[PDB]
Design a protein around this ligand. Sequence first.
Ligand SMILES: *[C@@H]1O[C@H](CO)[C@@H](O)[C@H](O)[C@H]1NC(C)=O
Ligand SMILES: C/C(=N\NC(N)=[NH2+])c1ccccc1
Ligand SMILES: C/C(=N\NC(N)=[NH2+])c1ccccc1
Ligand SMILES: C/C(=N\NC(N)=[NH2+])c1ccccc1
Ligand SMILES: [Ca+2]
Ligand SMILES: [Ca+2]
Ligand SMILES: [Ca+2]
Ligand SMILES: [Cl-]
Ligand code: NA
Ligand code: NA
Length: 466
Amino acid sequence: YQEPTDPKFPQQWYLSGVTQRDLNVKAAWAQGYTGHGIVVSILDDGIEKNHPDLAGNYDPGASFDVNDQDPDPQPRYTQMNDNRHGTRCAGEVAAVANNGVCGVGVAYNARIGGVRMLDGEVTDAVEARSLGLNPNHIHIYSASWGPEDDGKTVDGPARLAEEAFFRGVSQGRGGLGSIFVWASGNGGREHDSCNCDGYTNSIYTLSISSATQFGNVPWYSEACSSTLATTYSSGNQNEKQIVTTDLRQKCTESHTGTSASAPLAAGIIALTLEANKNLTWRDMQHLVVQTSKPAHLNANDWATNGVGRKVSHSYGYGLLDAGAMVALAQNWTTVAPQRKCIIDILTEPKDIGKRLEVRKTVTACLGEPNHITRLEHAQARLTLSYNRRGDLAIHLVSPMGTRSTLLAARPHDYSADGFNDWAFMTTHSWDEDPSGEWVLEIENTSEANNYGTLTKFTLVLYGTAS
Ligand SMILES: *[C@@H]1O[C@H](CO)[C@@H](O)[C@H](O)[C@H]1NC(C)=O
Ligand SMILES: C/C(=N\NC(N)=[NH2+])c1ccccc1
Ligand SMILES: C/C(=N\NC(N)=[NH2+])c1ccccc1
Ligand SMILES: C/C(=N\NC(N)=[NH2+])c1ccccc1
Ligand SMILES: [Ca+2]
Ligand SMILES: [Ca+2]
Ligand SMILES: [Ca+2]
Ligand SMILES: [Cl-]
Ligand code: NA
Ligand code: NA
């Protein structure tokens, strides 16, 4: 195998780096993995299917225009180039290699499509029709949309979109499950906390955050326990950005934000799926957990969990490692069927006041078909009232002592509507045994005399017993 010759490949520092600050993609390419036979779809504002770095890999079967209800996802051209984002993301995954144009995609032999669905009124039906597009042809979906990143919104998929997620992971891809790769958000400057975004907080989305070139948490990053891993993106003006295809058959060197990280992850996942086409949607999350690398990502919250892995609320398990992903995929044994252990915790409502702690010792469905000794995702589904929602901080401690932040204080969130069975999710106790004492902590981080009540706490464990 030889290095790509594309003119901008040297500028794709997150791929071509020789200083170990990269995604280790050349190592996967050298093992023979390029995305051949894999199909990825970008759910965004359209895709310039005639772009000279996309046309060779473009797949109409991975594409649709949900905004105008037609098969052709070509973007709507405007004076400000508003609808360029899907084309940028598509090139990150699957820009053609060795063709003298722009740079290359991570999976430069994968097929690439786009759903034009953000250029219009984005209803629940629009989202669901996009997530559910051709799920026995498209393997991997990439998306970075969700509720407003204003630091005061709590929202997620409505009924049709949630149903699309469960249909995709259950019957998609011949029953192995659609892989929904998701950006964790861009609300960092608003002090947003991404478990408040029900798309990235879902167990069905494989959620990705960003790191800057120098290894730092970018200004736009949101921290939360639902994130699984990290890829490089933009930072300050001394740090390089993402280099990819752009609208009007151009290249760009200034693609930015967490929405540039999710497509790189989708590309790495395409290489991995080429290495083992039989991986399930859960297998893929396991591989990410096992192979991602904290090293040289700076964060003040790196903590070692109960099985000895380092995990951060900014980075998840760390930077994706493509060579490690494709290597581990090849002889990976399919995980056992997913179990779900439901533990309704409260015997009475609990006043929150300044601070509330709820302790509960659980058997994790000992004796039952849903007995779990090997956790995957855990949720604390909470129903509570409070007079100012953003003054709350919420933590959940596993029996192995891993303290997941479920919610950080959000200064702009003035809502008096509380949380209505909101399923705060953590990945940080993956592979732990969830038997034992769990601790929920709710605290008022403000000096104000705030007040409210916790009326339901359901601990929901997913995982296996093998
Ligand atoms: C895929 O995995 C399932 C579950 O382990 C197994 O039954 C099946 O034979 C595998 N298929 C291939 C083609 O490896
Ligand atoms: C609000 C938002 N994303 N919010 C998120 N990912 N939580 C968005 C992304 C692309 C186009 C329009 C809106
Ligand atoms: C997808 C979405 N919102 N989804 C939600 N609120 N459940 C959205 C928000 C702002 C602009 C464009 C899209
Ligand atoms: C699946 C569902 N509702 N199903 C029902 N009411 N039978 C739902 C409602 C709101 C948000 C997300 C999902
Ligand atoms: Ca169209
Ligand atoms: Ca190229
Ligand atoms: Ca957000
Ligand atoms: Cl479920
Ligand atoms: Na997720
Ligand atoms: Na620990």
